[PDB]
Amino acid sequence: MFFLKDLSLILTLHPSYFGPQMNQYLREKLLTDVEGTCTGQFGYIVTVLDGMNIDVGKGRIIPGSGSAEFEVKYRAVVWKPFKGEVVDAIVSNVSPIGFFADVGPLNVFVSTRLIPDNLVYNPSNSPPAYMSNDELITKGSKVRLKVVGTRTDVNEIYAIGSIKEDFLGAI
Amino acid sequence: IWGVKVRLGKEKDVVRQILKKKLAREGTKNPLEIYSAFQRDSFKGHVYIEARKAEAINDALKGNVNVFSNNSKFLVGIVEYKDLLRPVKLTRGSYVRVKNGKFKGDLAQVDEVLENGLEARLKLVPRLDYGKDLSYTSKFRPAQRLFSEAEARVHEIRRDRDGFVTYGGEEYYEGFLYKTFRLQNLIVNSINPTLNELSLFDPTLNKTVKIRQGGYKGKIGIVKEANGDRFRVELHNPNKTIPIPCSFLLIESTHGWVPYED
């Protein structure tokens, strides 16, 4: 679920970096450290808005160490999924214990006891799929699932889905 | 029944003293009007005295050096009497903890008890040295390890039966010591098995030197530090340790002071 968030990062700068392009170095430094990373508090930080024009403020000099501390306030595109949110997906793997679906950055696992009985795993078919008569779940098939639980590793978050409900499945 | 506070450890003495006073005054014009007195181990520092009047309690204790002079006696309720006189395990195959000797603190199985009923034969993991330093205490004992009869055979033994050896006048059967302990020498209650029990059941330093060149020529010293090229000689003559180059030293050897050919 996408949001725009106004964030900030404390950056410590060694004194040997105190030159006329200090701000431009910091702008590159902010992007390298923040883009693509995930936190349980906000989700995946996809891209930062207006990176080349961010106002970094003034740097506080740390007493006793000489290094400088900047509070870089910024605005980013963030992606965090939520429990209860119904979403579409693209299946990445199919296995006897369910399937794995890539929803953008991460992967969601749906287990077998939350999958309807009429969807039967068919390995003999070429290519392998969950099949019916007018339904077809191959890789890249639009499927509609609902996120029923979010677990947080603070590095990557893990969400478990379900297709054991009305109107969810292939379309 | 009144309770009375007495000096710790002197409860039996006070009970004794009360009996002597009672018996000595029987039939006189001033009998001690108490019926009984007693002291329970579980109730440290107290004696209980049976009578009809409080004054008799004061009479029983008068002059007793083991009793606290403060007027501290207390009344017991009739409904509390019998509990004051409540008198209160061990089965073959069960575990106990030894309370005495080199095996103090060790877990042991109860193998059997004496006919009379006093000492119990215990099965114990031994703490032996195989006579290694002979010509024991609980603080200078050995680690626990099952008896090994071939080790005893090699190093220092009487066979008595299948898997039974008498070694240094103790009996070991299938690796375990079987030894009699007084029942009062084992703990049978509230034993907590331990983790371990659950698992089981430069060549010129410091040599004397003479200096042959420079302002300190002819003086004795000792090489205190020889890091490289520059030595540290602790001169004898003034209380100072000097930095000195290696070309300047003579070292003592078997025959005199020798230059850098040592």
Partner: protein, 84 residues
């Protein structure tokens, strides 16, 4: 919010002895960690000496944030404060 605009600054325009000592020490420290020096260095190579030379030519690139009792503050650059 807390910051006071340049035209409305009211604190003293002279560098105090305490501000001077902190500026010299901080700038000295940065030079010994190999910060770019803004003046020519001739014969005087001690860290404190170089920092004192920069001060005398009004070339120290630092700003004093003077806190007032209520928590508001006036930022003054060391380039604009008068040094006796």
């Amino acid at each position: 919010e807390l910051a006071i605009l340049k035209e409305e600054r009211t604190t003293t325009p002279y560098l105090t002895k305490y501000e001077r000592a902190r500026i010299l020490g901080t700038r000295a420290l940065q030079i010994s960690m190999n910060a770019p020096v803004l003046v020519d260095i001739e014969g005087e190579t001690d860290p404190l000496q170089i920092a004192m030379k920069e001060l005398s030519q009004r070339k120290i690139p630092l700003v004093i944030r003077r806190y007032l009792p209520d928590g508001s503050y006036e930022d003054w650059g060391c380039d604009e404060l008068i040094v006796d």
